[model samples]
Target: AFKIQLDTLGQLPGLLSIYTQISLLYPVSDSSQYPTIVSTFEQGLKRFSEAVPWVAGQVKAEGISEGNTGTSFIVPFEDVPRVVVKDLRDDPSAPTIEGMRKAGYPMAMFDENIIAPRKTLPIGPGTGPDDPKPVILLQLNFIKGGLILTVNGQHGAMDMVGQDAVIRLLSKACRNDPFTEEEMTAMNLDRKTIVPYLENYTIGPEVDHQIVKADVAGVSASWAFFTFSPKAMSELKDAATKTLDASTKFVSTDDALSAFIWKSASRVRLERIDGSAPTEFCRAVDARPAMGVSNNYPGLLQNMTYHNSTIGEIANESLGATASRLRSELDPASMRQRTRGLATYLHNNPDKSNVSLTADADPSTSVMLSSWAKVGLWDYDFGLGLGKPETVRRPIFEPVESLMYFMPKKPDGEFCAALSLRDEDMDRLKADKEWTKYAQYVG
Candidate 1:
C-alpha cells in the first residue's frame, strides 16, 4: 500500500494544538525545467510514501454518546491523515505559497479541532500580511522557473524543527538521493533522547489551573491577527540597535517583534479586561544543542525534557534574565541527566497524556519553538531547481495561543512572524477605533 496519513493511535497528543509548516523551493527563469521539476517532486513524494507507510487508514477513534452516533468502521477513509499539494496553473495571477497562506485553513479537514489558518484572503496572485491563508500557503504562478511547495503539520505531531528535518530529507531525495539511515539517525537526535520522571524536583505549589471547559463562554474558537509594516520593523530595529550592550551581541528580529507584541497585548489585557493581574505570554525554547546531544529516533523524550522548567523558583527574574536562566539550563551534562530522567518518567507513566491546559504551569516557560526548523526546513528542495525559499508563513497558529517561531531571513533580508490568539485580541487590533491604537502597531 502507498503511504497514508499518520496513524490514529500515534496522533492523539498532537491533534488539539498545532500548526505544521513546510515550504518547497524549485527553479526559476525557465519553463524548460518543468518536466524535470515534476519528476523530482514525484520522486520526493515516492520517498515520503516509503518513510511513512500507514497514512491511508482511519484514525484510531472510539467514543459514542449524546449527539454522537454509533460508529461502524469497515475502514473509514476520511479518518486518516491527508497530504495535500495544490498545483498551480501557469498564470501570472497564480497563487504563491505565501498567497495561499494568507488565506486560512479551517479545522474542518481534521479528526480533531487542530489549529487552522483563518481565511482572510483567497489563494491567488498579490497576497500580503493582511490576507488570510494557510502558512503552508501557496503562490503558484510566480514560478516562470520552478515550484514552491509548503506543508503544515499538526503541532502535537511535530514541531517546526521536525518539519524542517522532514523537508530537508525530502529535498535530498528530490535531488536523486533520499535520506540515508545515518543522516536520518543524526537528524533526529532530539526526539530519541528525552525521558520523563514523576517528582525529580518536587511538585512545588499545587498545580494552579485546570483545562477550561471546552464550552468556554465568550471564547471564539479562533483568534485574530494583524501585521506591522517594514517601517515598524525598521524603527524597532533601530532602537534596539542603539541599546545593544557589548555583553550580548545583538537583539533578534524576534526580540524586537515580541517586545512590540507583548507590549501591545499588555495594553489590551490591561485596558479592556476587568481587574487583571500579571499578564503572561509564552513561547517555546529549543534545547537541542544545549542538550548537548542529538537523537536517532522519534518519541516524546525531547518533547518533554525540553519543556522542563524552574518556574516558581526563578519567578522573580526579569524576562531577559529568565530567558538567560532557561538558556543556561542547556549543556551536555544537563541533557544527559534530563534525558535519563525523562526516560525513567515515561517508562513509568507511558500513556504520554496531554498537558492539562488549565491552571497549569504557564507553558510559555515550555514555549513551542522550532530550533530544528531553522536548520532543517530552509534546506528543503523539491528538485525543482529554484533557490532556497522565502517562508510563506511564519509559525503562528490559531486555536492555539502563545507560540513563537524563529526562522531564517528571506533572501530579500526581511524577517517574518506569524501568531494566533483569541478573536478578542484580533478585534482589538483590527478596530483601532476602540483599540485603534494597535491597528498599525509593529516591532
Candidate 2:
C-alpha cells in the first residue's frame, strides 16, 4: 500500500470532507453493445487504476482534541472493489435518455438515487483508522437506451481537473492507447507541495471569503436548468461592452453572462428582503495558469474569488460595471497572491472547523458558481459506439442552495447551467423578463 498525503488546499473544511458527484449520459442504439461496453469500461478502469492508483485508494484522517485536524492520507488500491455495474435493460419503469429530453431534462430526473451508486459512507468527517473513506466510486448504469456513468470522488483527493484527467485516461485505456511521456510526467507530479504556502503571508481584509458549516435541510430550494445559445451570449457580451467606459478593460463572455445571472438573482432577492441587504458573487478560479503550473498537473488548485455588493448596488449597476467587478479579481498576479495567501492562512490554522468558503456571507443573499464550460466533458470518446454524452450534469443529491454550475458547452455551441434558489425566488426568476430575454429556461 502507498500513501498520498492530502495537500493544504485539499484539506480545507469545504473540500476535505465532501464528495463531488458528476454524471454523463450517452445514448445506445441496441442491447447487443451492452456487454462490450461494460467490459470495455471494466478493463479501462483496471488500466486507469494502474496508471493512478490513488484514485482507487481509501481516505484516512487523523483526529485530535482540537477537532479533525487538517491531516489526511490515502491507503493504496488493493482488493477493495471500486466499480459497480447495474443492468436495468429489462426494467420497463426505468428512465431513458430520450425520455428525459422529452420531459425538458429536469434536474430531478438525474438524482443520484436514480442513477448513482449508494454512498458507502456518510458525507462528513472520517473516523480514525477504522473508517477509511473511498477516494473514488464509479457506478456504470445501463438503462433502456443509454449508459450513465456516475463518478463520485472524495474532494480531498482531487478536483474537477484531476477527475477530468483520470476520465480521459480511462477512455484511452478503453481503446488500448498508450500514454504520452508528458502525460505520465504530469500525473506523477507531487501533489502535496505543488502549490506551496506563501511564507509569512497574512490574511488581509481583502480575503472576504471563508469556509463555514451550513445546514441545508428544510431550505425550500428548487433547481432550474437554462441554456444560452452562442448568439445570445454574444449579444449579451456586446451589450455589456457598449456600456463600458473608455478606461474599462475588455470583459469576457463569461463575465457578461455571470453578471447577468448576478443581477437577475439579486433583483429577486432584493424584492423579498431589505433593499440594502448585502449580496455577494463567488466564482471558483483555477490557479494553475496564474501560478505557472501545467494544466495537466491535477489536484485541488482552485480558489474562490468574491465580489461583494449591496443588493441596491447590484440591481442599479449596468451589466458592464457588474462584469467588471467579476473580472477585476481574475487578474493573474492578484489571483496568484490571493491563492498563496489563502494557502498560508490554512497552513497556520490546523483546525478545519474554524475555516470555510462562505462563512461570512448569508446563503440567501449570495450566489456561488463553478464553471465546467471548457473542461471537454462532452468530447470524451469511450470507443463504445456512443460518440459523446448527450449532456453532462451534477446529480440531484447535492443539497446546497443558491449555487450554480455551468456545464460543458454543447457541440452546437450552447451553454447549459443548473442553479438552485429559494422556491419563491425561483418562481420570480422564472417570470423575469430581462432574464428570460437572454437565457432560455430549459427545465
Candidate 3:
C-alpha cells in the first residue's frame, strides 16, 4: 500500500516510482582508491536518498500489485530493498578488451558483449551482484569514465523511465534542488489508480489464449544530440527522399532512418545467420495519452513487435507495408489478445522453447531491432541545469549482435545509433552491393 503511495509523493518519492534501478555512469577526476570510491558512492546514495525513499516492494511475493498499461507489467516482489552497486578498477596492464571484459564479470560496468559468459564472483564485503547482501558494482575502467556504478532494484521499485528521471534528479541534487515537503506530498500516492490502454478500442482471448512465448526487459535506449548537425544528415535525407512515397501517412523521419538501417542490417543478418534465420524487432507502443497516464508512471506502455523480414536479407517490403504491419499488430483487438496470451503464459510457463530474447537466445538464427527517435528523452530535466542528457547507452542486454538506437545527432540532424555490430556479419554485409549503401551511410 505505502509502496504504491510513493508514486504521487513528489520528487524522490516520485523518482522511486519511476526507476527499476539506479544507474550512474560518469568519469572520476583522477585515479582513486577502490574503497574510497565505493564508500563515496554509498554515502552519496544514502544522502540523496534521504528524501527519496519510496517503499520498495517488501520482497514478499504476496505484497505485489498487478499493473496495467498505465503501470509496469510485473507485480512487486515487495520484500527486501537491496541495491546492487559495483566498482571496477581499470588496469593498463590488462590484456585484450575481451580479456578485460572477462575480468569485468565481477564488475558491474565492464560489459563487452551482452551474451559473453560471466560468472559473477563475490567482490564487495557486504553485498554484490552475486552476493546475498545488498550491493552495487563500482566498475573502474581504463576508459575515459572513471567508474560505472549501478543499483539494480526490483522493477516494482522503479522502472527505466523512472531511472532516467532520477539521473536527471541527481543532476538537480548536484545543483542542490532541496525537494521541499510540499513537493514530497505532491509526489506520493495514496489511491491505487491505473489509466487503462483501452480507449475507443477493443481486446480478447487471442490475447488471453495465453502465451508467455517471449518477454523483454524493456530497455529504452537514450541519446542526446548536441551537434544536431544537419550536414551529413541532410545528405542522408536527400538520399532517403526516394524511400518516402505519395502516402500521406505520417512519413516520420524515424521511419526514413529505420528503412535505411533495416536495409543495411537485413543484409548483415542474411550473410551471417543460417541464411534461414527469422529476423524480429520490437518497438514501444506509447500509450501515455490514451491510457491517461501521468508523467513518471514506470513502464507505462506495451511493445509492438514486427515479424516482417529477417536480418542480412533485403526486405523487398515497402516502408509503408512495414509500418502498416506494425499498426496491425498494435491494434486494440490484437493487442488485447496478445496481452491475454502473455498473461496466460505467465500464469503457466510454457516449455523452455517458449522463452526468447534472453542472454541465452540462439545467436545465429535470430536478431532484435528497435528505434528511439520520437521519445525525446534527451530533453529530460529534473529541475537541474544539466539541461538535456548528452547520451544514453545500455550495452545490448540480449545476445543481440545488432541493437541500434536512433539517438540525437549534431548541428541539425539526428544520428542513427549508439551502436552497430562489428562482427562476421560485418564482412558478409560489406560484400553485398545493395548493402554497400548502408555501409556508406555508416562511414
Q: Output the number of the TM-score-best candidate.
A: 2
State the local distance difference test value for candidate 2: 0.76
TM-score of 2: 0.92
Error of 1 at 170 (Å): 0.9
Task: List the candidate numbers ranked by lDDT, top first.
Answer: 2, 1, 3
Candidate 1 lands at a TM-score of 0.57
lDDT of 2 by residue, 1-443 (tens): 67777767787766765667778888888989888988888887787677767667877776545554747777775553377888876767667877877875566777677677654135434433355567777888888788888887777777787777767767787787888888888777777787667776666753446744355211888777888999998898998897765557899888888889998898888778886888888888888899888767657788888988898889878999888888878889888888777777777776766666666656788988988777767878677779888888777755467888887777787887888888888889889998888888866
TM-score of each: 0.57, 0.92, 0.57
Cα deviation at 164, candidate 1, in Å, is 0.6
Model 2 CA deviation exceeding 4 Å by range: 79-81, 118-130, 211-218, 245-247
Model 1 CA lDDT for position 45: 54
Show model 1 residue runs off by greater than 4 Å: 1-12, 15-19, 24-35, 47-148, 154-157, 177-182, 187-256, 274-276, 295-346, 350-373, 394-408, 411-413, 427-443
**Mind giving the per-residue lDDT tens digits that candidate 3 earns over 1-443?**
33342221111111222112222234444554445554443444454555554423321122233331122222233232333433234444322334423343122232422211221222224223222312111222233333343334333333344344444444344345575554454335332233222233333433321123345221222221111234544544445554444543344445555555565556556544553555555444433333444444433233334444554343555555444444445456555445434333333321222322222223343234444344334553323222343333333232224544444232235454533354565555546675444333221
Best by lDDT: 2
161 Cα displacement, candidate 2 (Å): 1.8
Clashes of each: 66, 6, 61
